[PDB]
Design a binder for this molecule. Sequence first.
Ligand SMILES: [Fe+2]
Length: 670
Amino acid sequence: PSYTVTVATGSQEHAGTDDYIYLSLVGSAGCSEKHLLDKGSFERGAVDSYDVTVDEELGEIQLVRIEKRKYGSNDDWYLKYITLKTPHGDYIEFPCYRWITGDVEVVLRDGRAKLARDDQIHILKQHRRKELETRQKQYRWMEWNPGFPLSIDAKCHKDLPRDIQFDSEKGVDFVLNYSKAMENLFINRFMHMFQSSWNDFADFEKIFVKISNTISERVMNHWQEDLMFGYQFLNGANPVLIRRCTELPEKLPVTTEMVECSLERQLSLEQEVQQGNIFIVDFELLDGIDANKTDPCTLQFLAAPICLLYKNLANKIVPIAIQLNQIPGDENPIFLPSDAKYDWLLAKIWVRSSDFHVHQTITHLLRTHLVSEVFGIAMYRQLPAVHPIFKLLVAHVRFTIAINTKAREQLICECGLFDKANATGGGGHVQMVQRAMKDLTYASLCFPEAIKARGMESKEDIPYYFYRDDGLLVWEAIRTFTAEVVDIYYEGDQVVEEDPELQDFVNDVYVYGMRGRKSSGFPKSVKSREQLSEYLTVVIFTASAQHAAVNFGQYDWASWIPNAPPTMRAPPPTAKGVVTIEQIVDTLPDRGRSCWHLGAVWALSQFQENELFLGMYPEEHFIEKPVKEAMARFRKNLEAIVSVIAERNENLQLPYYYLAPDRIPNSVAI
Ligand SMILES: [Fe+2]
């Protein structure tokens, strides 16, 4: 006449509670009494089980109610799951993975994923509708800054619902992690020297040689070469800007007689464009952006350079022309590799600095962080936990809302940590998000479509694009995985369309997240399994693979300041033959900003000791068999990719491992 109720406490630091825990089973034939549990503490990592006897036949168990009542001071409890062993020998499981504060009573369905059309009885429908009601009351949309994608309604981290907070209050913390990173890097004494320029490169080299890793040391030695400059646009930390030219821009008055020395095929520059040997990186987005004026004693400067690139006979991409500003003229020279050494070097440094600003604000912040947060909030608002898509996506939006809220509390807010080192600080980066937001499309988030639209899709013409190669693989694995999860729970396209909560989810992304602008190209609705599989792939790939590629290479390529400076303390050169090495040094970031730069890119490039990489789903929201085997196959494909990439890296001078599935986190956690 008894049930065996098993309760599992989380492994997180504060997962334990000393408060009262009541439990009541809700069955079809009736509900059970409230049973007090333990009368003691539920320690972290611990699993408790009780023999509970019921006074009347409950029939098939539908819901489990858990109730936390206070004892002493409040103590947050993290319930992982609950399993029942019924008198009829049935084993039922209830996935939770939620923080339980004394304010509310938590009610859980069984693990089996359910669409709304599957629930016909009052008890299940009541729960489902009330769950969404509480969701939409806790998770609300907000416009943090004009023209931004909508984000969560919270000023700071602690205001967030306990469920979507970090497991610790200061577990991740920009203020704390940065100063801690600057101590690990032995540069803590330099944190306040914004008026002190490095004496020469050797002065910074003395500091850098201690904290350099493999790639960065390679960067220290080879940053001045043309081959490395062009290399980063394909395999660097921000390889999303380069595109193949179909014609020379009229704002770039470059001639064959200027670049004839770099041309190696006896063709004119115009004819080289016809062969598709010419590539281009345009920073028009940076034009008009306000420079950092938050420091009255330091003048910081920006540029909007146009860089002309060329694929030589060795199939390597190298710079042949660099114009630092958008509108051509006598004071906006076109710098060439045939100019004096420091002229062509300083021109390069500026393009590198420009690449860095677009990287952090557009590629990094907007196109991965903010986009994922949108998918995350829309998921919480419109998708109940029993829904299959919730179970699939929840592992990929982990800590996303939390890390963004932290960043808006400390990093990119007015007078935030971002303002110290960056030339886009002081509001400039806000202008960039706004302007880029206008051209952020749904197709641009679809990886194969994104690569083609830049004209980089050909493996044959452009064989050394590793970001593309590995990316296309990881994308194909996730597309295959989601197509299978969708095929399990959706009989056909008609079921996908008739799903009210899925459409509500898709609609919340279009209308609120993307501000309901028609030019974004996001689906207003999803009416087929094929489309749903692509949509889910966009969500997962962005939060995992795409974010990994553009985040964890920050210390590799940017720890050597002259290769990716956060700010320039002198305006772009308007004339040739003038620039000296002493002036490049005084233009480059000071000691204070170099150190807040070094600390930042180091801290953002770290993996957690408990980091969950792609395919790792420790928390079991899905408990059904067909989806387990789906998840299984997905892990096999990923492990097949890690091998493919591993072999390829053996034949490279500088391996590309950012998109290797064992280094790709599940979500945006940093
Ligand atoms: Fe990030």
